[PDB]
Design a binder for this molecule. Sequence first.
Ligand SMILES: O=C(O)CNC(=O)C(=O)O
Ligand SMILES: [Mg+2]
Ligand code: NI
Ligand SMILES: [Zn+2]
Length: 331
Amino acid sequence: AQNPNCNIMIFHPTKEEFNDFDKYIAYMESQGAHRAGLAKIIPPKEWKARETYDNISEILIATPLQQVASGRAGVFTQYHKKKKAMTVGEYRHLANSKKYQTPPHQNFEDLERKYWKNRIYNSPIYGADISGSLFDENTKQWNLGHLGTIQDLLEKECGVVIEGVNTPYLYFGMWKTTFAWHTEDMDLYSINYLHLGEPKTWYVVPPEHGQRLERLARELFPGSSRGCGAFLRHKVALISPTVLKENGIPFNRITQEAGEFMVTFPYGYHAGFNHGFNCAEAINFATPRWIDYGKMASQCSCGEARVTFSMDAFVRILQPERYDLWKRGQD
Ligand SMILES: O=C(O)CNC(=O)C(=O)O
Ligand SMILES: [Mg+2]
Ligand code: NI
Ligand SMILES: [Zn+2]
């Protein structure tokens, strides 16, 4: 069995190996990469996402979100307070202001310590889930706006044509901006490219151990758990590495830097934080191996999680018994 300890693997494809996305995902899996829940892919040195980042300041962040925490330093929830629109140039200036800028630190480990000690005492502002892309149209390899769609994959594997589209999203971050513990919608893969700026630290639980995380989360967030059998789908709960280690939960950590891709695998719980001003692009995708995870994915039917249009068909075809309850939650 490849990668039995479920370590995060790092890949260095050549330019030739970078030509066929599906083939390279399947290669990484043949080496056991999925067992970690997360892999890093360093593009060949011949590759670039676009020519420069000099021309992005006029992108609008229509609904910046202030991430306000409740709880204790290692076990907290965050809610997202809506703020007034601002451009990427305005947001960058904000991120670099004295109130929000990254503190002096020694190394990634010292910054991680500072994040876990101090995150709850501040409310950083995140530009999330902005539809769009920063890949140049002439980038032909690993262009996240030109991947095969999930609707086409379901059609190829199962034979049924479905409505829906699959497009990328941009994330503009600053110090302490946080992504809570979650798997992807319908336990899909994701791919995330860090276009520019400061790093992003990730935490991940192996898919084979995902239920251990869920059980701890129900214990640590007991009112949220009563509210929703799939409350991690609300994407609000944070648990520190120290708390995970105290509770014997298997996990790994890694820091992504600008110019690097991360792939999350089906049912790989993940969480993390940004080091400073940055911009990432991410999209969900599927392979033949995903279908069995999609059929078994939990769902939030309480009203909170509220998702994309395109999830309807995935529930409807893969989970017909759950569909009527899930849809009632959407309305
Ligand atoms: O960068 C982010 O805010 C969040 N990362 C992810 O959840 C991802 O690509 O799946
Ligand atoms: Mg611009
Ligand atoms: Ni994610
Ligand atoms: Zn819910």
